[PDB]
Amino acid sequence: LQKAVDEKQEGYKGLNNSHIIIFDIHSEYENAFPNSNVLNVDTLTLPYWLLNGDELEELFLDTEANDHNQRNVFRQAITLN
Amino acid sequence: KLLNFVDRLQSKIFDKRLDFILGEGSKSVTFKETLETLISYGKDKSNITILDVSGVPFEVLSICVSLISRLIFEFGYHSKKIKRKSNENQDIPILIVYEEAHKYAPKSDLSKYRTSKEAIERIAKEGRKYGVTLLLASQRPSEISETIFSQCNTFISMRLTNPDDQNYVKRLLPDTVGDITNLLPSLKEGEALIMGDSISIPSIVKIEKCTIPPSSIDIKYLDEWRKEWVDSEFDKIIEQWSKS
Amino acid sequence: LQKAVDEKQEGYKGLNNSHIIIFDIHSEYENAFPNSNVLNVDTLTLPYWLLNGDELEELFLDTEANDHNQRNVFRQAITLNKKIHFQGDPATKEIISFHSPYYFDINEVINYINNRNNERKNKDNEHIWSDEEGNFKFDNENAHRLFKENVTPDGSSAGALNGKLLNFVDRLQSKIFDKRLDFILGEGSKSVTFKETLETLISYGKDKSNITILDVSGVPFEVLSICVSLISRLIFEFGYHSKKIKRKSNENQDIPILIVYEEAHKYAPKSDLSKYRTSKEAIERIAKEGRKYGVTLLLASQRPSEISETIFSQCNTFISMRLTNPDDQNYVKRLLPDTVGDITNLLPSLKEGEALIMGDSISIPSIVKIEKCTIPPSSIDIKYLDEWRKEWVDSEFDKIIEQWSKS
Amino acid sequence: NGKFYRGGDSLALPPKKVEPAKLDEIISIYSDSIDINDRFTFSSLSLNTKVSVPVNGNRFFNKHIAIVGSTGSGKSHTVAKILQKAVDEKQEGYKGLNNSHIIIFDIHSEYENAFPNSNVLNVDTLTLPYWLLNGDELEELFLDTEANDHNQRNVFRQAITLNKKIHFQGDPATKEIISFHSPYYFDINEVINYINNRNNERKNKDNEHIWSDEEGNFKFDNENAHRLFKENVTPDGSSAGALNGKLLNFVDRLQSKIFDKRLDFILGEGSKSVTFKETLETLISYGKDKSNITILDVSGVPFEVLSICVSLISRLIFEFGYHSKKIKRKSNENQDIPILIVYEEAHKYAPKSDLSKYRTSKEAIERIAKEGRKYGVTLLLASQRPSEISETIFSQCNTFISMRLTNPDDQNYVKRLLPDTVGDITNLLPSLKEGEALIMGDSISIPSIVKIEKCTIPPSSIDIKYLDEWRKEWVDSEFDKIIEQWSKS
Amino acid sequence: IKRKSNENQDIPILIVYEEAHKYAPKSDLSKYRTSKEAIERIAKEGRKYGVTLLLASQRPSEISETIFSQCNTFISMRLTNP
DNA sequence: GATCCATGCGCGT
DNA sequence: ACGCGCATGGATC
Ligand SMILES: Nc1ncnc2c1ncn2[C@@H]1O[C@H](COP(=O)(O)OP(=O)(O)NP(=O)(O)O)[C@@H](O)[C@H]1O
Ligand SMILES: [Mg+2]
């Protein structure tokens, strides 16, 4: 990823067109790329409403109980909203 | 009939761990500003966007990986809609790096990891033509599913020591090297093996040393265990826990 | 753990900064570490109000029998009693929920259900009550006055929940009044401070020790999953809130904690049964995220087959002794990060005290002999033939039975 | 210098002259690995008769013993021969029986002949009180409903815990700590009387149940709940109680099992007059007739009564030792007693199958398999197939006496437990005739095929001469004697 | 009955099970269970009670191994399957 | 297929 | 009108 960034088309000066997303758990790629953008839990703002039906179910509902009555009002509340 | 459900949700909305997904800032944020944040197109442009998911709880870790992977993919899916209409030469290609890809994409059709399974597998199957490609970096290849691992064509096989890991890799490798069974666990530091369309033949390579290396802030357990029994530190922990 | 607490730098004498908490169920490490805080059933005073809503429905409640009316009055009593006893800002007061871990009086919760067991309403069908201050509507503003026992209902006709909680109350009086749950429901558990609970677990109280044995041998089985999960959550959020002040303080002052789970397959089984789901989730929480926050597992289990695949995979150093069960060997060899020559028959043939260590903390996977423990966990192996060889001794059955009687 | 040290790692530089080993050297192989006072010899080598093979008798018994082999191979004679040498294993200085304590679960009436001076306890004379149960088996016995019985479950423990407090005749300090699992005497007929009373509850407007007995009306609370144990009470209330008409089927299932005379040994009238002290003197033989050998006849009883009989005794002998350690742990003396439990044909109650009818007997022998080494309660597993016993119990035995095995899976089960250095001794397993066996484990120096010593006093398990009994007359079997004992059984 | 008279078992009974795969097979379904354990009890503990079995079957690999292990006497006709 | 619980309807004190 | 007792029925195991 460092090599894929520092190569340019030599006709300019500045950032190139590379676009990289890293899902690091060990919190280690800040020291690799100091001039990058880091999105930890404090600064990242992911919208809950951009989740689909399956991601909204896992975020809120429980699979172990699996009670049919809990799920139905959640669809009626969210789809109407 | 809905008090535990109303109680279960309220515990998630006011959870300080889920502030990044259920806080008041998530309500006021816009759909456009999220995508500037995800590929660094906001006030500060950057080629690398690091998603530090260390603080993300593991129950919602598969949810947020799936949400971001879906948002990047249909960013590239609708990118082609302009290119067939305006016929412009420019393009926005995106590469996603999934460190520890075995947990995001396991070999299980379980509910708890299904959401992050299909988001990665959609990118691995359709994202070639939309400019959304993935890089898989896992220490355990044998838990990555075959229907996503085989969609990769370039394979950088480093030193692999678990015999269950060697047999999974050797089956899905596009080409073979002489005595690959002994070569893989005997690779030194930085020694790799690359095959696929990008390379000509499978060659044992030596990756260049990182001048600015990726280092993690790991708690040196033995180093702090040599020190004095800390006394003032304990009273600072509880009072912030009490206040937050 | 003996060489962890004896490993010091050349600047002092006494105790170092090692913090080890052992979940001992077979009662083995009291003699192993004689300079430690062994916490028994009677010694432990674990507060019931630090549980979330999942453990509260596993400590007092049971399986559902279309008893949502009885379940709702239980949750609405606790989630209201948590608000009244809260002495903070009103902004935090509204976010208080059933799963939120603040103090509530369990005896006042009984009195709320006891009053709701006999409620009377007027024609307007409003639950009207009588107290020493005056007659008051039953509503969310005045429902906190039902926690007192000396309240008399006043109404023309019987209320909605009148006589519908009689079988709810006596089950609860079988719990706080049960003497096998004294640690998690006793009067000391009411008056224990949240700070006092954490300094007991990590041994930060008056008697400070590097190693804390959590003797859970006498803890009952149906409650053991609640207490393992509660302590594991409390230790993890201690380490979680360690790092939240570490960013602000920006100083090298850390409290690293290592948790030893013996018979770790019991609290973390691979089966999806609802009995051990609380303790599995707390151990998995530290297995996945505890590396960042300074809380580290030590999974020790004599039968590693039922340890869950996700939790056991987070381990990076493996100390494999002799394993006779083939199901254990196929489990171990598959998730073992490295391998050695002729390892299939090596696992049964490992000697007494001989270990195979591999990981990323040791470069060469080596077969080692663990240095003999000079302060042992006492060898519990009764010499048998020579003790049979002697005379027929008169076993004192009276004191054996009377200790059996009190259990 | 006549002392044998194990280990093949010693290198002999060639050439070294070779002689056949002398007699005393052949003794030295199987003897010097054990100290002089820990030798427990009960067998000889098959290749050489004049050598004896002693095992580490201290290590032979504390680590569990598993004896397996095909039918008729000689397991029962070898099990008996181990115990006869264990009883005779006395120290010098005294005449009388020694401190051996062996309990045999005998299911074919064999060990009566092998041990004549022994105590034999069949079901009809064995009295195992129902109040000795620790709540876990108090639930599985009486309750036939498993899932949604929370009110029926609650009234069951509340009656028993309150009735255990009543029959307490001592100081009130240990009256309080009586619980549902605490082993105190309670009367089962009063417990039914309480539950049948609670099925006839009546309450007033205040929702508090009021009763009426021969002394007067009383409120039902904690102190006056003891007065529902008598039948001669009448309810005085305007409305039906909280449990009115909900315990009718509960009493029916509870009564039908007390009067079930398969469970007459546990739920009979003899459990009233038999105390905690007399039961432990019965199962261990510390009573008037003190014996090293205890035999229980569960031969032709049905499975369910056999399953409770195995599960009760195995835990109650363990929980004897589970509470025999903490008295020694708090006093620090050496006067313990070691107990060995012989499980003949453990497939009948501790198999590899995961059925729920095999559940409560597996854990009782599981708990002796791992934690029983800590409290002096050891187990001796006899079975026909090694692969039919559960691996949680059967792999915990560190001493193996294997007879003839012809099954490939049974041969494979011995094979992978053993290493490959001495794994070639398994190939002589199906060629083993009556008598000889292989002893392996930590109690012996080398695994070897050995010839078990013949029982001079054998168990009553003589092989039937099938052909010699067929050459005779058509004998007239007295069918009335067999049938009228079949019907009584 | 004879043990009370201190005698051995008088009459011996042999039960011939022709084509035991129909009722005591290798398979572990519930419909074969109650006929399986009926012949297990003769194979396991029937030696000392005078009740022995004769197992006639078309293949050694379809009969349950637990009955088949206790059969010490083995007769084998032509067997084409390896 | 129990248990446990809610809700409705008709009736006497 | 409030109450108690009898139903029919629902959910969950
Ligand atoms: N050491 C021995 N020497 C000679 N014969 C022996 C010896 N041990 C056993 N036998 C013979 O074995 C037969 C009885 O076998 P037994 O001791 O009942 O083995 P078993 O495996 O327990 N039978 P089973 O219960 O069906 O498995 C008799 O014919 C004995 O003579
Ligand atoms: Mg036998």
| Ligand 1 and D347: CB distance under 6 A | no
Using a 10 angstrom Cβ sphere, with 0-12 exposed, 13-18 middle and 19 or more buried, the burial of residue B216 is middle
SS3 label, residue B117: helix
Chain A residues within an 8 Å CB radius of B9: 60
The verdict on a CB contact (< 8 Å) between D62 and C406 is no
CA dihedral (C278, C280, C283, C287) in degrees, to 10, reads -140
Task: Using alpha carbons, select from D403, D460, D400 the residue that is nearest to residue D433.
Answer: D403
For the CA of D71, the nearest ligand:
1
Pick the residue whose CA is nearest to atom 23 on ligand 1.
D72
Of B14, B55, B229, the CB nearest to C95: B14
The verdict on a CB contact (< 8 Å) between A27 and C292 is yes
What amino acid is encoded at D317 in this protein?
I
Which nucleotide in the DNA or RNA is closest to residue C160, CA to C1'? F6
First to last CA, chain D: 64
Please enumerate residues of D whose Cβ is less than 8 A from a Cβ of E: 70-72, 107-109, 345, 347, 384-385, 388, 405-410, 460-464, 466, 469-470, 475, 477-478, 481-482, 485
Structure tokens at D128: 């195992």
Task: Using alpha carbons, select from C84, C131, C120, C78 the residue that is nearest to residue C100.
Answer: C78
SS3 label, residue D102: strand
Q: D76 C-alpha vs ligand 2 centroid, how far in Å?
A: 4
Tally of CA atoms within 13 A in the half-sphere of D73 that contains its CB: 30
Of E10, E48, E70, the CB nearest to D461: E48
* Token pair 């151990």 in the structure block, residue: C283
Counts for chain B of helices (H) and strands (E), in that order: 13, 6
Those residues whose beta carbon sits under 5 angstroms from the ion ligand 2 are D 76
The verdict on a CB contact (< 8 Å) between C327 and D391 is yes
Find the radius of gyration of the CA atoms of chain D. Answer: 28
- Show which subunits contact E, needing at least 3 CB pairs below 8 angstroms: D
Chain B residues within an 8 Å CB radius of A59: 12, 21, 60, 63
Question: CA B13, CA E21: separation in Å to the nearest integer?
Answer: 63
Q: Left, alpha or beta for C153 (phi > 0: left; psi -120 to 50: alpha)?
A: beta
Other CB atoms within a 10 A radius of the CB of residue D391 amount to: 18
C-alpha distances (whole Å) from D469 to each of B62, C170, D458, E70 are 75, 69, 22, 22
Of D61, D148, D416, the CB nearest to C385: D61
| Ligand 1 and D44: CB distance under 6 A | no
The DSSP secondary-structure symbol of C16 reads B
Structure tokens at D280: 């432990």
Which nucleotide in the DNA or RNA is closest to residue D205, CA to C1'? G3
The distance (Å) linking the CA of C298 with the C1' of G1 is 69
The distance (Å) linking the CA of D235 with the C1' of G5 is 17
Question: What's the resolution in A?
Answer: 2.9
Other CB atoms within a 10 A radius of the CB of residue D227 amount to: 16
Strands of the D234-235 sheet, one edge to the other: D217-219, D210-212, D234-235
Cα of B80 vs its chain's centroid, Å: 25
Cα of B213 vs its chain's centroid, Å: 19
Find the radius of gyration of the CA atoms of chain E. Answer: 15
Structure tokens at C309: 């695949």
Question: CA D248, CA D239: separation in Å to the nearest integer?
Answer: 18
C-alpha distances (whole Å) from B166 to each of B180, C331, D348 are 9, 17, 44
Chain C residues within an 8 Å CB radius of A27: 292
Structure tokens at D178: 């009586």
Residue D150, CB, less than 7 Å from strand G?
A: no
List residues in chain B that are followed by a break over 2.5 Å (C to N).
none
CA dihedral (B200, B205, B208, B214) in degrees, to 10, reads 100
Structure tokens at D217: 């009306």
SS3 label, residue D339: strand
* Token pair 């680590």 in the structure block, residue: D63
For E21-58, b/e burial (b = at least 16 CB within 10 A) is: beebbeeeeeebeeebeebbebbbbbbbebbbbebebe
Task: Transcribe D31-44 into DSSP letters.
Answer: TTTS-GGGEEEEEE
Give the gap in angstroms from C-alpha D379 to the nearest C-alpha of chain E: 22
Give the gap in angstroms from C-alpha C61 to the nearest C-alpha of chain A: 15
Chain B residues within an 8 Å CB radius of C4: 225
Question: CA C108, CA C149: separation in Å to the nearest integer?
Answer: 8
Other CB atoms within a 10 A radius of the CB of residue C317 amount to: 12
The distance (Å) linking the CA of C53 with the C1' of F2 is 29
The verdict on a CB contact (< 8 Å) between C253 and B232 is yes
Per DSSP bridges, beta strands D210-212 and D217-219 are antiparallel
Give the gap in angstroms from C-alpha A3 to the nearest C-alpha of chain B: 10
Residue D207, CB, less than 7 Å from strand G?
A: no
Of D405, D406, D485, the CB nearest to E1: D485
Chain E residues within an 8 Å CB radius of D385: 66, 69
Other CB atoms within a 10 A radius of the CB of residue D444 amount to: 23
C-alpha distances (whole Å) from D127 to each of D183, D268, D389 are 15, 8, 29
Residue A67, CB, less than 7 Å from strand G?
A: yes
Residues sharing a CB contact under 8 Å with residue D362, sequence separation 6 or more, in sequence order = D349, D350, D351, D390, D392, D393
The distance (Å) linking the CA of B1 with the C1' of G10 is 13
Residue A55, CB, less than 7 Å from strand G?
A: no
Task: Transcribe B162-225 into DSSP letters.
Answer: -HHHHHHHHHH-SS--TTHHHHTTT--TTEEEEESSSSSS-EEEEPPPPSS--------HHHHH
C117 within 8 A of C158, measured Cβ to Cβ: no
Strand G positions closer than 7 A to protein CB: 1-5, 9-13
D443 within 8 A of D63, measured Cβ to Cβ: yes
Other CB atoms within a 10 A radius of the CB of residue C42 amount to: 10
| Contacting residues 177-196/C vs strand G (CB within 7 A) | none
CA dihedral (B230, B232, B235, B240) in degrees, to 10, reads -100
CA dihedral (B66, C308, C3, C381) in degrees, to 10, reads 170
Beta bridge partners of D55: D40
The verdict on a CB contact (< 8 Å) between B54 and C292 is yes
